[PDB]
Every structure is written in structure tokens, then in C-alpha cells.
Subunit: 208 residues, 6 copies
Amino acid sequence: MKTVLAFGDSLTWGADPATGLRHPVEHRWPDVLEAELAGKAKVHPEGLGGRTTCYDDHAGPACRNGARALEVALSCHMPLDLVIIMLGTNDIKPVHGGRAEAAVSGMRRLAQIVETFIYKPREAVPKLLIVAPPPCVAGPGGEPAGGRDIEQSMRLAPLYRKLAAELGHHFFDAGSVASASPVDGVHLDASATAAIGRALAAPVRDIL
Amino acid sequence: MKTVLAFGDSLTWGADPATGLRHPVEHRWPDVLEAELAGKAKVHPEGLGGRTTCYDDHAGPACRNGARALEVALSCHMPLDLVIIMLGTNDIKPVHGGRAEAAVSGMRRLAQIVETFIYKPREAVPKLLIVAPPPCVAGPGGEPAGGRDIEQSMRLAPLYRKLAAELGHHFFDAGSVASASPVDGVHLDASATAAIGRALAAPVRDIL
Amino acid sequence: MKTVLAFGDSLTWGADPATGLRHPVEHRWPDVLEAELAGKAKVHPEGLGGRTTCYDDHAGPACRNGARALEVALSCHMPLDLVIIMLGTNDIKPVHGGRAEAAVSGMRRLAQIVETFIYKPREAVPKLLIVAPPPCVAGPGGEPAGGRDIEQSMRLAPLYRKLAAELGHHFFDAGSVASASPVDGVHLDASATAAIGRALAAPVRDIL
Amino acid sequence: MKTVLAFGDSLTWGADPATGLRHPVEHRWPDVLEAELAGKAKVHPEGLGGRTTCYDDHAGPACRNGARALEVALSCHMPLDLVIIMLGTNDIKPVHGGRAEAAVSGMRRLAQIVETFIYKPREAVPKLLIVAPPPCVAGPGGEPAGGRDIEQSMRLAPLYRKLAAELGHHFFDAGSVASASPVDGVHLDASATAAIGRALAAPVRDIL
Amino acid sequence: MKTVLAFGDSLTWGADPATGLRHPVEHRWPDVLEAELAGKAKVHPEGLGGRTTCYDDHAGPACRNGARALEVALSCHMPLDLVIIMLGTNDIKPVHGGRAEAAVSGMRRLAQIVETFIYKPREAVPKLLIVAPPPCVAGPGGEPAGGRDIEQSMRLAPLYRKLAAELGHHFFDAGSVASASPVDGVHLDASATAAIGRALAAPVRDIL
Amino acid sequence: MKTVLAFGDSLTWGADPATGLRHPVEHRWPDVLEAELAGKAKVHPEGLGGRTTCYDDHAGPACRNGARALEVALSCHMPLDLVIIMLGTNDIKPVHGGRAEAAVSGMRRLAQIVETFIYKPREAVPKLLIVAPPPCVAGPGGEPAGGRDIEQSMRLAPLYRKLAAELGHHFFDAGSVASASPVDGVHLDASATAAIGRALAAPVRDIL
Ligand SMILES: [Cl-]
Ligand SMILES: [Cl-]
Ligand SMILES: [Cl-]
Ligand SMILES: [Cl-]
Ligand SMILES: [Cl-]
Ligand SMILES: [Cl-]
Ligand SMILES: [Cl-]
Ligand SMILES: [Cl-]
Ligand SMILES: [Cl-]
Ligand SMILES: [Cl-]
Ligand SMILES: [Cl-]
Ligand SMILES: [Cl-]
Ligand SMILES: [Cl-]
Ligand SMILES: [Cl-]
Ligand SMILES: [Cl-]
Ligand SMILES: [Cl-]
Ligand SMILES: [Cl-]
Ligand SMILES: [Cl-]
Ligand SMILES: [Cl-]
Ligand SMILES: [Cl-]
Ligand SMILES: [Cl-]
Ligand SMILES: [Cl-]
Ligand SMILES: [Cl-]
Ligand SMILES: [Cl-]
Ligand SMILES: [Cl-]
Ligand SMILES: [Cl-]
Ligand SMILES: [Cl-]
Ligand SMILES: [Cl-]
Ligand SMILES: [Cl-]
Ligand SMILES: [Cl-]
Ligand SMILES: [Cl-]
Ligand SMILES: [Cl-]
Ligand SMILES: [Cl-]
Ligand SMILES: [Cl-]
Ligand SMILES: [Cl-]
Ligand SMILES: [Cl-]
Ligand SMILES: [Cl-]
Ligand SMILES: [Cl-]
Ligand SMILES: [Cl-]
Ligand SMILES: [Cl-]
Ligand SMILES: [Cl-]
Ligand SMILES: [Cl-]
Ligand SMILES: [Cl-]
Ligand SMILES: [Cl-]
Ligand SMILES: [Zn+2]
Ligand SMILES: [Zn+2]
């Protein structure tokens, strides 16, 4: 069996837009992806609410710096055949600059980490699939939750695409199959979450 | 005798908008609060210039992360009957996002820290009073010192009020009794600082 | 299905004593434990080489502080029914003091973290099983690898037992079913590793 | 009126040897010192259980690095006439080397911090009194709690005295006043604690 | 012979605007400055791509916090006759607030660090030259690389000049010598870089 | 012209065992090495008092973690043909374990960092020379300064030699040409320091 790290934020954890509680496992994208691959791959879910690509954020009960946690994830789960990273939604929070630039820079740093990590064995370098999260939409007040800007979130797909092409990795736009909930303008309902896991099965087969 | 922690930033330290030097003790809000309580409470002042709710900031001579310092203050001064926190003014600096969202997320974290800290004895869980600082005002340039946004500072009161209600803690708006000085748009003169100490006496007495 | 976090160091990752490469998944204690529970529970493996209970160690490619990583693990995998922690082998390295005291202190800190974490939902507080790792034995040179002391490693079982009794959690001594390899005096061969996963099924059933 | 910072660990917080609960205020050394000074001085207590001179220690609920917390305490309480530091008891724990060298090196760093801090106003440089804590004694089992070495704890007085003379600051040996409790070999009962505050009045009065 | 520390970011390292590769040594400003000083001084280059004044930034392969690295550079190269700091270009990135206030606050902190550092010998306090980097210009797409704001970059000169006068140090506007390259709006070509080193000789000669 | 990084601690800075002040430039090993190479190499000295291989140590005025600083040195001075590292003397302080194991684990990490760093251009991967510092000697008390163990310092050469051979890098034992001074048991006098610079010329020439 191939092994896959599914690395992300609360969209990967599976936060309900209304309650903030976790979606049933049957609807979480990493579990869905694994079920879709039907015994080919084992998917290790590592979705942390508030996680950024590479920016400290102490507003939660656990460390939100994606790069530090990615290193731990790589060590815990190596050897890995594929790493999938869906991040950027928190990098466009005002505290982290409010713009897509910080998300693409951080994603480039995570790619370099995956590429150059000291794996056991050294030859076990995983492939990488960079996933753009679905863009934000108008929340109830007319804007997305957390002061995020819609137009900046919409820049993540083309910037991540261009980054993946530069670095020689794969890209998928989760916004092409799923939309943010209008309950908060940011998070995904169960249906949209499961549609991401289903949609990722195809590229994950091309890659593996 | 009740014990109270007064945890804040230079508004709590008592920074003179003019000199940047410290207000005399008689005009600092923690001391004024203690004097107004006429011997019923001991108030421990912990006001640090530049302190944020939960964001690292290395531009001063001392750690500005409110969450880390709060844990230290809770341990040094426990058992505490009440924690009063007045923070947010630095969270709206441009480097921390320039917006109120970061402040309220950080205040939620500080509230969680107060609730769940490992106290000696464990049952000594303090009550919590969340205080919105007075908003910034048009400074001598037409803008508050440090690039802070007046509009964003004015969102702290309503967002903190909702937060306090959600978590079942207490709220007071210091802007209801005091305004920032036009000298720099941010800090409080001696009578505005004393005004907060006096106004906090009523709710603190009710809470204790 | 119940959910279980399996939190540890390279003994939990499954390092081969000779090569340092990972044991086949069939022999890793978290996978074995899950297979033994036969659909009752899902076990999330989080075994990181070099991990300590609560001590920084920058000698590896990823963060080794168990407490910081435990917080991330709890957020990624909550709601959890049970956390199992097998740590201490690295806490008795000379750099961390060379003695069992540091391991028991750190384990107490991890227990407090599990108890008091801000879970979604708040009511989802997991049970805890504290696992003492098998003691070190004479490596090739007459002593265990890494300057570890045999007699100190042998203190982990009784100290962890007493800690678990104090805190009202469960305890298992992995040394009662598995022995360190003489190849390095510290790590576990595949057989000893799998015997730990098999042996844990019983207490894990009593607990769940 | 003069202001004094009383910076230490659980000996300064006032941990009861038997229970770990805080001594009553009238038996804590900072409070006793203030009462003896009879209105010459206000003393700000900053005693944190587990605090080291300058060493990270994550086994507690709050940061134990004395240097980082000292910077915070200076900023919160400046302008200060005098800083009193009683630390070293935790630096001789095995995790921090088990020896007195680390305590004296750390005290040097703390003295440097007090000397060179960016005070408001810049010329308000406090005087410094370096205090050797009372040496450990045999606890119930025959040695002090926490793996501490009696012989090493007895070196702090001579080493701190030489350090104080070298840097041109003041020294006081709290061990020449009171002794550690045999209840755990490390902490101070309420009358030993009060004795230290009383004995401190005279030299503090002279320094001020 | 005098010694000089040249502390900066990729403008000091010498990043070519088109390729990102290092300019040849004879076109790097520190080397050019040393050649012009004609044996009066040795200049130690410490230019790190991405370096901010005092802000953590984890998007690169090395620490970008200027304050922490400045302490290291002072210790490595002390005793120093003069410190030259050219920073600010990264502090105006959106992730760090997008504005000049953070650069000037950070420069103040760096100046404080140089003034108050524990030098060997203690009296070897270096002089300080604060350098405003050349302002950003429109890149190919119409604005500078990295989301930087031209208007904000133009504030560094007046703000640094006022800061330098306030603290009693020297100021030099590198922007009054050379301009950012329109290849990316931010970095300096080899002849602009050399021009800054040449222009620095005269004031450095006078300061020394 | 080749470029060489000379990365170390106060032995590399050139600490006078007597005064603690810096050796004249003519007697520092990096400068002596550069002079011996008679214009064929540029040697960048980066020696920091108290530096460890990879362990935080807050007892000085600057960060002592060798790994973090190495990343900074690699970025500031790349492209580099060769990195020379002489570290270990501080890793054997009691606070870091008092033993050679920590030093060799940290040297492995530093070697990994040199190998895998994101260089500009990526193909500019330096060669590596690992240098064992001269062992500690009986100081004026009969023991080396700082509680260091002579026996443990003597293990650095054989452990580093094996490490270098395993990783396919170069090794030199500075103890083969120099001894620590009996003045403090730890530091090197001016002729011992120069002796290392001269002896390193042969292998450095062969490596380049
Ligand atoms: Cl950050
Ligand atoms: Cl974080
Ligand atoms: Cl795994
Ligand atoms: Cl935000
Ligand atoms: Cl790939
Ligand atoms: Cl595109
Ligand atoms: Cl494809
Ligand atoms: Cl006050
Ligand atoms: Cl932060
Ligand atoms: Cl901070
Ligand atoms: Cl108190
Ligand atoms: Cl409350
Ligand atoms: Cl206004
Ligand atoms: Cl630690
Ligand atoms: Cl760590
Ligand atoms: Cl999970
Ligand atoms: Cl070790
Ligand atoms: Cl339990
Ligand atoms: Cl027992
Ligand atoms: Cl049982
Ligand atoms: Cl007290
Ligand atoms: Cl430390
Ligand atoms: Cl700490
Ligand atoms: Cl105060
Ligand atoms: Cl310990
Ligand atoms: Cl030490
Ligand atoms: Cl010392
Ligand atoms: Cl003094
Ligand atoms: Cl005085
Ligand atoms: Cl240069
Ligand atoms: Cl920061
Ligand atoms: Cl950084
Ligand atoms: Cl130098
Ligand atoms: Cl940015
Ligand atoms: Cl700012
Ligand atoms: Cl400023
Ligand atoms: Cl100057
Ligand atoms: Cl000069
Ligand atoms: Cl040199
Ligand atoms: Cl460390
Ligand atoms: Cl450090
Ligand atoms: Cl260079
Ligand atoms: Cl090599
Ligand atoms: Cl000897
Ligand atoms: Zn493909
Ligand atoms: Zn049971």
C-alpha cells in the first residue's frame, strides 16, 4: 500500500461552518480519499484548525505554524509516497498580511521542506500535490469571517498553479469542485468536504 | 481580602502620552481601583508596554506576547479571585494585522487560559472581567500613533461584549468613561486613567 | 468506532535497532493494537524519533518537544476517546538530565495537557493510558546507546505507575512484555514491538 | 517612596513544603520585607514555581525561563529602585545539569539584564541584590526532592558572593538566616520564609 | 585598523534583480566600502535575504529576525568600531504590516541592542550608522515585487533620519545615491550596489 | 578564489584564557588559515562565545544554538566552497548533559544542514570539514572551567572521526596540534590558536 499525508487546516480537520464541530468521518476529505482509493493507499489525516503555511499564530490551543508541524508529520509518517497540502485560508487572515503573497511564499517553503527533509531512508522523497482551498464567499455580514478578502482567496489557485509548475509538482484547485459555505463564508459543509476527497482520487491515482 | 490581577499593556502600566514616562501611582488604574475598593481587594498590576493579546512582537526590550505572560502572572499571583484584562490596542498595529479580529481571537485564548490553568489549589479558578480599551483618536497628525486604525479600535467594545457573553464572563467598556489623548492618539492622560480605575470599582465589587 | 491516539518516540514509529529504518507496518505497535481491536477502534500513530515528554531537543530534523506536538496531535485528531503515551527513553539521555525524574515530571505535564485541552466539543476529554517503555539493556560496548543509564530506565515503570495512580489514569509497563534489543541496548526488534501492540489490546478494552 | 522588585521561584511565591499551597501573605518574604520597611518601600512580588535563572523548562503550566520573565517584570514595574533576585534552587535540578555553575552563569546573565535594560526613563537603573537561596537538606527518603544535590546547593552562596563583588552589586545569603524544610528537603516553611523577609530589611534599607 | 559590521538583507548580500544570484564580490556594497577605505577598516558582511528588523519570518531557509541575528553578529565580530545597518525593505512586506512604522520601530530596537550589548571589553561600544535602503519602484507588472508599497518605502528615509537624530547616531540615505531596479522593483543591480559602497566611504571615514 | 566558512565558538572567536578578551587578529585560527592559504581562499569567521552544536543556551547576550546560526551563516556567505565547524566544547557543559553524545548528535545535525540547505545557486553545496576541538585540561582548580569533563572532551575526536567517515565528509583533530590552556582548562592561548590555523591549511588545500 502507498502512504499519503493529508496536511491541512480546519477544512481538512472537517469543521462544520455553523457549529465548529467535526464532520462525521465518512465526510472528511482524507477519509473519503482513502475509501475512494479502495486499498491502494493509506491516508494519514493531519488537519489542524487555524494552521498557516509557515506563520506563527498563538491564538489557538496548539501550534499553528505549518512548517514546524509538517516536519513532525514527515518524521512520524515517513516513508511517505505522497504529501498533499491544502493551506492558505488562514494565511490570508489580516494578522498574516491579508494577501495571497504570504500564502504562496509559505507554500514554496513547505515544498522545499518536503523535498529536502532527512528521510529514513534518504531515498524515500515523497511526491507533492499542492491544493488550493476553495475561495471565501460572502458570509452573513456581506464579507467572509475573520476579515478575509474574497479577491485575495481567489488568487490562491492561479498562484499555486504557477508555483507547482515552477517546482515540478502537481496542483489541484479544490474550488473547482467545492464552494465555501455562506454560513460563515470560509468553511465547508459535509457535502463540499466529501466532494474534495472524491475529486482528489483522480490526480492521486495519476501521481501514485 | 480578595486578590485581583490587572493585566494589560502601557495603558495599564500608565504611559504618559506626553513624556512616555509613567503616571504617578495615584493615577494608574490598578492603584485607583484598589484605593476605590477601600481595603477589600489587593490589586496586582501587570501592565507591559507593547503587549498584545497573543502575538509575538520583538520590537521592545521584553516579550510582548500576552498569553505567555498571562500564564506567568497567573502562577506568580495565584490564588486569584479575579483577573481583569485590558488589551487590544497593540493587536491593531499594522504588524499584527491592523484589525479587531486578531484582538478578539487573542482575548478568547486568554479567557481559555484563565479558565483551564493548573491552579494551586485546583479549585481556585478566578472570575474574569474583559475590558475594552478606550478607542484611538485622531492624533496630532490626524492619525493615531503607530499607524493604528481608529475605526478598528472602536470595534473592540462590541466584539469583546459578545465574546464575554458567549463565554459567561464579565465585560466593561473603558471607552464609556475615558478617551485616548490627542497628544498621540493612543495613550491616556492621568485623569482618563484614574477615570477607568474608579469606574471599574462598581462592577468589580459586584463580581467579587 | 472509538478513536485512539498512539503518541510516542522511535519505539512507536518502529525503528529497527540495527538499520534505524522503519519496521513493516504489520509489526508496529499502533497498527498491531488497531488490528487486535478488530474494528472497535481507530488508532492514530504519532511516533517521532527522538521525542521527549516536554524537553526541547534540536538535534533532529523535526521538533522533539512532546508537549508542543501533543497539543497539535490533540487538535488534529479530536474528538479522541483515549490517548496512549509511551515516552521517557529520550528524557533519560544525558542532555535531558540522565535521570527518571525528568521523565515523570514531563509525563505529569502531558497528562495535564490531555486533561485540560480546549476540545471541540469541550466535553470530549479523552482517557489516558501512560505506558512505561521497556528498560534499556547492555548495548555492544557494555552500556546502552546514547549514554542512557539502565538503572534510571528501570525507574520509569514504578514512577509512572505511581503517577497514574495519583492522577486517576491507567498504566501499563511495556517492559513486562518486551525487552530492548542488545544490538543497541535501546530500541525494539519487530517481535518485541508487535508484542507491545498485542499486550495493549487488553487494557485498551478495559478502558474503552 | 522606593520601589523594589522581589523576583524568584516557589521560595518567593511561598510554597508550603507539605501541601504545595501558598503560605499566607503575612509569611511570604516579599510581604514581610515590605512590612518591615515601614512605608519606605513598595515591594512587588514575582515568584514563580519552577523558575530557573535562564533555562527553558516546559514541565510546568507557565514559562520558567527567568531571564525572559525578568525582562517582563522590569518593564511592568519600572521605574525600580532595587531588584532582589533569589534563584538557583531549580538550576541545580538534574535536567539543568545538577550543578551550581549553571546557577551562577545564569545569575550573571540576570545581573547583565538589570544593568542594561531599556528603562523609562533611561537613567532609572535599579540597584541589585543577589540572594543565595537556603541550601537543600535531606528529605524523608534521605536526599532532597527533585534529584537535587545538597553539596551543589551549598556552593551558591560563595559563588554568588564572588559574582556580586565582581559585578559591583550586593549579596545576601538567605541560607545564613533560615534552612530548607526536611518535609521535602527543598522548600521553606512559613517561619523560615518570614525570617528571610525580616533579615532582608536591614540591608535593603541601607542599599536604598 | 578599524572594524565595521555591515548588517542587512539581500541588498547587502547582493542579490541580482534578474536571477537572484549573488553579485560578484567587487560589486557588493560592503566589499566596495572596504576597498574605498583603503586599509583604514575591515568590513564584515552580514547580509541575509528576507531579513527584517525584528520580526520573525519563517518563509526562508534561515532565521530572518534581524534583532536575534544582530546579537549573534555583534558577539562574533566584537570588538567593533562601527555598525552599519541597512534594513526595512522586508518590514514593509504585507506579512509584516505593509507600512513603514514597523521598520522604524524595529530600527529603534536594533539601535538599542547595539548601544546596550555586553561587549568584550565592556567599553568597546560601536558607533552606529542607520541606512535607509533605496525606495521600491514599479516592477514589470506595475508595482514592486512582494506586495510592497512604493509610498511606504519612501517614508524610511525621513523616519530613520529623525530616529537617528533622536538617539544620537548617524544616518545615511542609500536612496539619495542609487535606485531600485525596475527588473523587480526592489533589488539593486550591480552598479547601484557598488555606488552605495562608494558613497558610504566618506561618512564612514568621518565617523571612524 | 575559494570561499570558506569558519564556524565555531569562543575558540574560533579567539578568547584569551587570561583576559577573556579577543586574541589579536594575527593569532585567530580563521585569519591564520587564510594567511597560510596565501590568497587562494577567503575565510569568513563566525565564532560565538558559548555556542553549542544544536542546543539552546540563554546564559549569554546572544543566541547560542549552532544549528540556527549555521543556517544564517550559510545564507549570508553562500556560495561557499567549504564549511569548517569546530564545536563541542560547550555541549559538554553540565547543563547540556556533560557528555560527548550530545556533541556528536549535534554535529550530525549541522552536517545534514550543510548538505541540504537551499543554496543560491542550488548546486553550490559546500564541502565539509568537521574539527574536534582540543580537549579540556586540568584547570587551576584541578578541573576545567564551567564544570566540563576532561574525559568527555577527549571523546570528541574519535566520535567526530567516525561521524565524518560515515557521512563522507572530512575530519581534523585540533587536539593533535594544540592543547587548552591551564589558565582556565578550556580556552586556547595565542600560539595554540595559531597552531590550529596553520595545521588546517594542508587539509583545506587538499579539500579545495
Ligand atoms: Cl511567524
Ligand atoms: Cl504557532
Ligand atoms: Cl504512519
Ligand atoms: Cl486576524
Ligand atoms: Cl510531485
Ligand atoms: Cl493559472
Ligand atoms: Cl497531470
Ligand atoms: Cl498600578
Ligand atoms: Cl505570533
Ligand atoms: Cl514577544
Ligand atoms: Cl501575589
Ligand atoms: Cl467570570
Ligand atoms: Cl477621533
Ligand atoms: Cl526544554
Ligand atoms: Cl524541539
Ligand atoms: Cl483524525
Ligand atoms: Cl545526550
Ligand atoms: Cl483515564
Ligand atoms: Cl510500583
Ligand atoms: Cl484496570
Ligand atoms: Cl508576597
Ligand atoms: Cl534553555
Ligand atoms: Cl520555559
Ligand atoms: Cl508597579
Ligand atoms: Cl530534573
Ligand atoms: Cl552548566
Ligand atoms: Cl559565571
Ligand atoms: Cl547595585
Ligand atoms: Cl535608591
Ligand atoms: Cl561583501
Ligand atoms: Cl515576530
Ligand atoms: Cl525568523
Ligand atoms: Cl571578526
Ligand atoms: Cl507578504
Ligand atoms: Cl506596526
Ligand atoms: Cl519608533
Ligand atoms: Cl553613533
Ligand atoms: Cl572609531
Ligand atoms: Cl578571525
Ligand atoms: Cl535545545
Ligand atoms: Cl540559544
Ligand atoms: Cl560573504
Ligand atoms: Cl565533504
Ligand atoms: Cl589534563
Ligand atoms: Zn500528473
Ligand atoms: Zn481499568
